[PDB]
Amino acid sequence: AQLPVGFKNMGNTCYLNATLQALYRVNDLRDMILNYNPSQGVSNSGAQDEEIHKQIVIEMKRCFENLQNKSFKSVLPIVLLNTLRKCYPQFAERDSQGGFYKQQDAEELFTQLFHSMSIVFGDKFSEDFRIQFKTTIKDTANDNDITVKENESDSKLQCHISGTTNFMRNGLLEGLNEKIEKRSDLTGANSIYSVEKKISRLPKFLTVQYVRFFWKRSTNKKSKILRKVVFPFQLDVADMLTPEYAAEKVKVRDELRKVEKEKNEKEREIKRRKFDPSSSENVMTPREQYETQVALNESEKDQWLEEYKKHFPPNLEKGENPSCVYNLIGVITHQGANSESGHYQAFIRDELDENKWYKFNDDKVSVVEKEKIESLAGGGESDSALILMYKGFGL
Amino acid sequence: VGLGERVSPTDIEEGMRVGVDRSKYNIELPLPPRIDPSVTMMTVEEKPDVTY
Amino acid sequence: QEEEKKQLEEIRGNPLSIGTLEEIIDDDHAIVTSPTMPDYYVSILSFVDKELLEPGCSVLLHHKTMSIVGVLQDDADPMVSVMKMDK
């Protein structure tokens, strides 16, 4: 709906801002959050910090409603931050002006936020980020030993960009070849294991976390892996998918294609109307006609999304993506190797025109393109992705 | 020379430009190869349009 | 006026060794060739808008550290003045 705007900064809350706008732009997630009332309570009484987790969720409600508003660039993150310190001692850390909080790892903030929603909603939030893997564990020296896990799963996928990488795409491959060792020689030596995951069940919403923070031993400093990556606007994951799962996904994708065309047909017919003047209605600015048309458009777009979801087979399970394609909606980029006082920037795909993106440099709004984000060289030459947020097509 | 803050081996290639410091002579950023494409990209004109 | 003036003296130590702006990368850095065979990956600092600068423009760079302190040149050569004979 209404255009996203400045997110109030006040110093040392850059990281914090970026992650919050990021979550908001997911359509489903926004609504569940808006529809959260303390009357429904926590859906898990498995946590001694059950009450605090409700409170976070409510402050994010506040932020989201105001973010959407074109009027309010205030969202008041002063209280939200306070709450975070109590919930988790990670966020009480690091000396700074006023309270004690400073710049942090957006990776740390994201994992912690994740549990907060998970406890309040329960399993509903969770299924929308669960990744199953059929993982084969074969010792490089003892290939003969093969131990198979089928129930291995994780909420989050790691893209390792250490080792030869030049692209995000390459890095997604390397990320499956985690390497672990095992003191047992009943599994065949203390050699590195090739660990090879295929994804056998996609979630509705996919979280990519760049792993790259490490202490560069040789220079005795914090560093981050400097190797080039480039993130294409459209992602396709068809190769990582196990053949059998992949076929179903290609069929589903076709119904989705039809809606995307009717959505872009009636979109063009909007642009024409605005282009022409208002003609006779007499002692009126054109502006009053124009605002009305802007309002139609935002409505029509939410309506089109609902058509994709209804058309999906009732065979499809909640917590599965309909397709093998995803669309980039939010990039949390990081700058500076230190995150002790590095700077976070946010790129958020525009609602009203998916084509357009708003770069939110904290409070300050500037217009950039989808292309500008593609053209990034990544590394340290320019801003480079640390967390990527990917949305199933048509959701 | 050597790596500055931390410059991956895999970034530096024959023909790749480098940014090095005045006199402490260490790589900060790998820089895209060659400055000569930029010069010649001025001449380049995109898909001209004329009706057949 | 006073604003302009104060600033201009501070920033500009002189002499100022001119460059040619070869390309921009959006991060307020530019790549320029100076008259020296080593080129210099420079910051854009102060004055001239980023937009206003388009590649192929000739530019003023500050001698202590090379930074884009403005433009007043527009690829001024003596050859143009010679030719120019509206007189």
From Swiss-Prot, chain A:
Enzyme class, first EC level, given as a word: hydrolase
Question: Which residue ranges does the record assign to the USP domain?
Answer: 5-393
Q: Where in the full protein does the shown chain start and end, and how long is the full protein?
A: 105 to 499 of 499
Oligomer status and interactors: Associates with the regulatory particle (RP) of the proteasome.
Sum up the protein's function in the record's words.
Answer: Predominant proteasome-associated deubiquitinase which releases ubiquitin from the proteasome targeted ubiquitinated proteins. Ensures the regeneration of ubiquitin at the proteasome. Has proteasome-inhibitory activity and delays the degradation of ubiquitinated proteins to provide a time window allowing gradual deubiquitination of the substrate. Stabilizes the association of HUL5 with proteasomes and works in opposition to polyubiquitin elongation activity of HUL5.
What protein does this entry describe? Ubiquitin carboxyl-terminal hydrolase 6
Q: Name one GO biological process term.
A: negative regulation of proteasomal protein catabolic process
- Residue segments, region Disordered: 261-287
- What more is known? Present with 6770 molecules/cell in log phase SD medium.
Q: Which UniProt keywords apply?
A: Hydrolase, Phosphoprotein, Protease, Thiol protease, Ubl conjugation pathway
Q: Which residues carry this modification: Phosphoserine?
A: 366
Query: Which family, according to UniProt?
Result: Belongs to the peptidase C19 family. USP14/UBP6 subfamily.
The GO cellular component terms are: proteasome complex; proteasome regulatory particle
Q: What is the activity regulation entry?
A: Activated by it's association with the proteasome.
Q: Which residues carry this modification: Phosphothreonine?
A: 285
Q: What is known of its domains?
A: The N-terminal ubiquitin-like domain is required for proteasome association and UBP6 activation at the proteasome.
Swiss-Prot record, chain B:
Report the residues modified as Phosphoserine.
8
Coiled coil ranges: none
PTM entry text: The N-terminus is blocked.
Question: Which top-rank group of organisms is this from?
Answer: Eukaryota
Q: Where in the cell is it found?
A: Cytoplasm; Nucleus
Query: What is the protein's quaternary organization?
Result: Interacts with UBR1 and CIC1.
Q: What does this protein do?
A: The 26S proteasome is involved in the ATP-dependent degradation of ubiquitinated proteins. The regulatory (or ATPase) complex confers ATP dependency and substrate specificity to the 26S complex.
Record family assignment: Belongs to the AAA ATPase family.
| UniProt miscellaneous comment | Present with 105 molecules/cell in log phase SD medium.
* Listed name of the protein: 26S proteasome regulatory subunit 7 homolog
- Organism of origin: Saccharomyces cerevisiae (strain ATCC 204508 / S288c) (Baker's yeast)
UniProtKB/Swiss-Prot annotation, chain C:
Q: Where in the cell is it found?
A: Cytoplasm; Nucleus
Could you tell me the superkingdom of the organism this chain comes from? Eukaryota
Q: What does this protein do?
A: The 26S proteasome is involved in the ATP-dependent degradation of ubiquitinated proteins. The regulatory (or ATPase) complex confers ATP dependency and substrate specificity to the 26S complex. Has ATPase activity.
Give the family this protein belongs to, as stated in its UniProt record: Belongs to the AAA ATPase family.
What name has this protein been given in UniProt?
26S proteasome regulatory subunit 4 homolog
Provide the gene name from the record.
RPT2
* Parent-record interval covered: 89 to 175 of 437
